[PDB]
C-alpha cells in the first residue's frame, strides 16, 4: 500500500489486499458512483456522486438494493446463493473492483451486470467474487449495482418523477464512472468488455442497443439472456397500468400522474415489495412486474424492432446458454412441480403449465405450442411432459430470444461466438431432473472450482480455468481462442460449442428449427387473430 491507495476524479479510495492461490489481488469495495435515491430522490434518475474528501473506506461490500427475497428454502444454497448476503438498503449504488498484483498499466476491464429478472440481485454474491478471474487471467473485474423493482423501473414515461428505465440509467452512470476513473486502478477504458446473466444479459443487450450507452464499452457477453426476451421489456401503457395498480393496492388516492409518485415515495420499502407482484396481469412464470419500459428516448422502439432494423452498436459478441434453462422457473408456480420430487406432471398439469408459460396467448397460439412440444405417439408420458415444459420455458424465455439476437447480430458480419454449458456439477444441490440449471455456469466463469474449500473435481478445475481463459481471451482478442478452435455463429451457420469436462467440441445448430416457431411464426399468428 503501495497498491491499496487509489485517487480518482471523484475522490480517494482505500483498498484491501486479498490472497488468491500462490499470490494475491487488491480489492476496492463499496465505491459510490451516485447519490442515494432517498425520500423525494426515490424513483428519479440517478444523480452522479458528489466528489468526496478525503479517503473513502472501500474495504467492505455495501448493502444490495431493496428486493423480494427468496425464502422458499432458508436452509438451502440452491436458493440462498442468489439472495442478498450483506443486507438491503435504498442507498445501494456502489461498484466493487478487483485489481491484479502488482497493479497493471492498461489491463482489460470486465464489467459484471447481475441478473435477477430486474426485481433482485447483488454484486456482493459469492458467485460473482472477482478474485479468481483477476488473479488467473490478470484482468480487472468490476461489478456494478443497479436499482431493481418498482424502485428501479416504476414506468411512467414522460413524467420526470418516474422516467421508467431508472435501473439501466444506474447501470449507465456506473459505466460512465468506470471510463473516467479505471486507469488509476491500472486498467484500459478502451478494453472495457461488459458481461451479464439473465436480466444482466438483457441489460448488456440494452446497452448495445440504447443511444448514449454504446461508447461506454468495447465488447459484450450475454449469458443465458437477451434484450428481446419476452419478460425483458414492457409497453408504456402496461407499465403505467402496473404503476397505478401499485398505488391502488397500497391504498393511494391520486388524480395527477406525479400525485401517484408522491404517495408511493412515502410508503415503506417493504410495504411496496409486498404488493409489487399483485400488478402482473396473469397467472404466469418467468414474467417480472417492474422491468424496462419502451419510453421513446432510452428505447426509441422495441429491442425486437431495433435488432431487426440494425439500430445498435456493431461489435464482437460472446453468447450462450445452459442445458436446462427452464427447470429453475418451473418450481415457482407450475402445477405438480417441486425440487423435492420427480415432477412427473399429468397431461392436465402440462396443459395448465403451457397456459402459464405463454400467458398473453389466445387458444390458437396455445394449440401451436402444444403441437410442437407433444409426442403424438406417446401423449400421456409424465417424463416427456416434464421435459417438454422445461423446453417451452427455456426456449420461449431464454434460448430463442438469444438465437434471434445472434441471428440479427450476424445480419451485419459481426463475429458472434456461441456456447452451451452442459456439464452438470458433481456437487450440484438440485435434483437430477433439473439437469444443468439456469445460472450455474457463473461459478465456472468466476473460478469458484479452484477453491479447495468448495469441493469440486480436478476435472471441474480444468473447465473453470478454460472458461476463464475463453472469457478473458474474448475480452482481449475478440476471439476466445489462441491460434496454433471455436467458430463464429451466423443465421446461415448457427454453430455453437460445448463447454464441459471434454475437449471443446462443435455443434451445428443452436435450436434453429424450434426458434423459427417462437421468433417467426408465433408473433405472426397473434398479428392475424
Amino acid at each position, epitope marked *: 500500500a503501495g497498491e491499496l491507495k487509489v485517487s480518482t476524479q471523484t475522490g480517494s479510495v482505500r483498498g484491501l489486499s486479498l490472497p488468491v492461490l500462490d499470490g494475491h489481488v487488491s480489492a476496492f469495495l463499496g465505491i459510490p458512483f451516485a447519490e442515494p435515491p432517498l425520500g423525494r430522490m426515490r424513483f428519479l434518475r440517478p444523480e452522479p456522486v458528489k466528489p468526496w474528501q478525503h479517503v473513502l473506506d472501500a474495504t467492505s461490500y455495501k448493502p444490495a438494493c431493496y428486493q423480494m427475497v427468496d425464502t422458499s428454502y432458508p436452509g*438451502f444454497q440452491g436458493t440462498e446463493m442468489w439472495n442478498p448476503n450483506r443486507g438491503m438498503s435504498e442507498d445501494c449504488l456502489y461498484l466493487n473492483i478487483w485489481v491484479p498484483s502488482p497493479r497493471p498499466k492498461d489491463a482489460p476491464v470486465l464489467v459484471w451486470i447481475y441478473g435477477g429478472g430486474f426485481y433482485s440481485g447483488a454484486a456482493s454474491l459469492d458467485v460473482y467474487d472477482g478474485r479468481f478471474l483477476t488473479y488467473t487471467q490478470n484482468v480487472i473485474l468490476v461489478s456494478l449495482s443497479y436499482r431493481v423493482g418498482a424502485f428501479g423501473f416504476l414506468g411512467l414515461p414522460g413524467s420526470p418523477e418516474a422516467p421508467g428505465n431508472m435501473g439501466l440509467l444506474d447501470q449507465r452512470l456506473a459505466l460512465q464512472w468506470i471510463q473516467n476513473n479505471i486507469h488509476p486502478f491500472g486498467g484500459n477504458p478502451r478494453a472495457v468488455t461488459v458481461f451479464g446473466e439473465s436480466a444482466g444479459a438483457a441489460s448488456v443487450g440494452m446497452h448495445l442497443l440504447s443511444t448514449q450507452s454504446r461508447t461506454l464499452f468495447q465488447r459484450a457477453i450475454l449469458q443465458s439472456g437477451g434484450p428481446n426476451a419476452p419478460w425483458a421489456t414492457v409497453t408504456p401503457a402496461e407499465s403505467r397500468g402496473r404503476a397505478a395498480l401499485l398505488g391502488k393496492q397500497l391504498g393511494c388516492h391520486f388524480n395527477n400522474d406525479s400525485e401517484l409518485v408522491s404517495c408511493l415515495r412515502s410508503k415503506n420499502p417493504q410495504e411496496l415489495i409486498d404488493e409489487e407482484w399483485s400488478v402482473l396481469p396473469y397467472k404466469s412464470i418467468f414474467r417480472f412486474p417492474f422491468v424496462p419500459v419502451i419510453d421513446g428516448d432510452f428505447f426509441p422502439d422495441t429491442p425486437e424492432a431495433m435488432l431487426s432494423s440494425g439500430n445498435f452498436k456493431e461489435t464482437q459478441v460472446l453468447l450462450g446458454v445452459v442445458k436446462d434453462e427452464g427447470s429453475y422457473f418451473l418450481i415457482y408456480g407450475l402445477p405438480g412441480f417441486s425440487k423435492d420430487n420427480e415432477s412427473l406432471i399429468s397431461r392436465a398439469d402440462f396443459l395448465e403449465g403451457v397456459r402459464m408459460s405463454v400467458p398473453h396467448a389466445n387458444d390458437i397460439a396455445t394449440d401451436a405450442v402444444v403441437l410442437q412440444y407433444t409426442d403424438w405417439q406417446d401423449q400421456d408420458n409424465r417424463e416427456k411432459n416434464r421435459e417438454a415444459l422445461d423446453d417451452i420455458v427455456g426456449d420461449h424465455n431464454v434460448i430463442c430470444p438469444v438465437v434471434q439476437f445472434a441471428n440479427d447480430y450476424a445480419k451485419r458480419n459481426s463475429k458472434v461466438y456461441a456456447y452451451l454449458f452442459d456439464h452438470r456439477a458433481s456437487n450440484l444441490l438440485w435434483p437430477p431432473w433439473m439437469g444443468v440449471p439456469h445460472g450455474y455456469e457463473i461459478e465456472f466463469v468466476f473460478g469458484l472450482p479452484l477453491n479447495d474449500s468448495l469441493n469440486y473435481t480436478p476435472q471441474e478445475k480444468e473447465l473453470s480455468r478454460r472458461m476463464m481463459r475463453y472469457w478473458a481471451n474474448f475480452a482481449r482478442t475478440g476471439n476466445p481462442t489462441d491460434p496454433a478452435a471455436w467458430p463464429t455463429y451466423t443465421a446461415s451457420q448457427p454453430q455453437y460449442v460445448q463447454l464441459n469436462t471434454q475437449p471443446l467440441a462443435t455443434q451445428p445448430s443452436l435450436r434453429a428449427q424450434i426458434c423459427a416457431f417462437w421468433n417467426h411464426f408465433l408473433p405472426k399468428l397473434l398479428n392475424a387473430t
Partner: antibody, heavy 125, light 107 residues
Framework: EVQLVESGGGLVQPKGSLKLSCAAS????????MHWVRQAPGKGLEWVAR??????????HYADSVKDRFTISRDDSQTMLYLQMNNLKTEDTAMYYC????????????????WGQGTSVTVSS | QIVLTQSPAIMSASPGEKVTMTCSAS?????MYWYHQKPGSSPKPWIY???NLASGVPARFSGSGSGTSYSLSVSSVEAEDAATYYC?????????FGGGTKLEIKR
C-alpha cells in the same frame, strides 16, 4: 413480547375431525411464515405444515402423512393460525405446537424461533 | 425424507467437561439448526445456520458442520445444560429433525 397461544385440542374419535387455533402477538404476523409442528409422547418433533405470507401467495406445504387430510390456514386481520384436521388417526396423537419462522430481517432467519406452549390432541375410541 | 441421526442418544458429562454431539444427515444439507428442549416446555431455538448462537444462548455453546456431518459443542458443561438437543435441516421438504441427544450432567 412475542407470544403464541394454541387452543382447540382434545379427545377426538378415530376418523373424526378437529380444528386447532393459534393466537399470535408481538410481531408483524402477516410478514411471517407460520408452521405447525407435533410431538408424540416421549418422541421427537415432526413437521406438519407451513403457510407462507400473502406476498408468497399463502403457499401451503404439508408433511406427506398429512397431505390432503390436514389444512393449514391464516387470518392476518385476527392474527390467527389454524389447523383443520380431518380423518384423524391414532398416529396423530401428539402435542401440537404453533411455531413462527424467523424472517430475512431476523438473526433467526429460517429457524422456528418461537414455539407456543402446545395443545394436546388424543385420537382414541 | 432426509433422515437426521443424532448420536449419542444419551450423553453423560461431569461439570466443566468439553462435550460434542453429532448429527449425521442421510443426504448432504446446506445448514443445520439446533433447538434445546427441557421437561414440560416446548423447544427453544439454540443455533441458527450451523454456527450462529440464538439470543440468550451462553458463549460456551458452539455449532459447526458441513455436508452430511454437523455437531454442537459445549466447552465447559454446567448443570443448566441438562436438556434434549435436536438438529433440524431446512434444505429439502419435509423439514426434518434428528432423534435428539439427552445431555445429562454428572454430580
Amino acid at each position: 413480547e412475542v407470544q403464541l397461544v394454541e387452543s382447540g385440542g382434545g379427545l377426538v374419535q378415530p376418523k373424526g375431525s378437529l380444528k386447532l387455533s393459534c393466537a399470535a402477538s408481538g410481531f408483524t404476523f402477516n410478514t411471517y411464515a407460520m408452521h405447525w409442528v407435533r410431538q408424540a409422547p416421549g418422541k421427537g418433533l415432526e413437521w406438519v405444515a407451513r403457510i407462507r405470507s400473502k406476498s408468497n401467495k399463502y403457499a401451503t406445504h404439508y408433511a406427506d402423512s398429512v397431505k390432503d387430510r390436514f389444512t393449514i390456514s391464516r387470518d392476518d386481520s385476527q392474527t390467527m393460525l389454524y389447523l383443520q384436521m380431518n380423518n384423524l388417526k391414532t398416529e396423530d396423537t401428539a402435542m401440537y405446537y404453533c411455531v413462527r419462522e424467523g424472517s430475512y430481517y431476523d438473526s433467526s432467519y429460517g429457524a422456528m424461533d418461537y414455539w407456543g406452549q402446545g395443545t394436546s390432541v388424543t385420537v382414541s375410541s | 425424507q432426509i433422515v437426521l441421526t443424532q448420536s449419542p442418544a444419551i450423553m453423560s458429562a461431569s461439570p466443566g467437561e468439553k462435550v460434542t454431539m453429532t448429527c449425521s444427515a442421510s443426504s448432504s444439507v446446506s445448514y443445520m439448526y439446533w433447538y434445546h428442549q427441557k421437561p414440560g416446555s416446548s423447544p427453544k431455538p439454540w443455533i441458527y445456520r450451523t454456527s450462529n448462537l440464538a439470543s440468550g444462548v451462553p458463549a460456551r455453546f458452539s455449532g459447526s458442520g458441513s455436508g452430511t456431518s454437523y455437531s454442537l459443542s459445549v466447552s465447559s458443561v454446567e448443570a443448566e445444560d441438562a436438556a434434549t438437543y435436536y438438529c433440524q435441516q431446512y434444505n429439502s421438504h419435509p423439514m426434518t429433525f434428528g432423534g435428539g441427544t439427552k445431555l445429562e450432567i454428572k454430580r
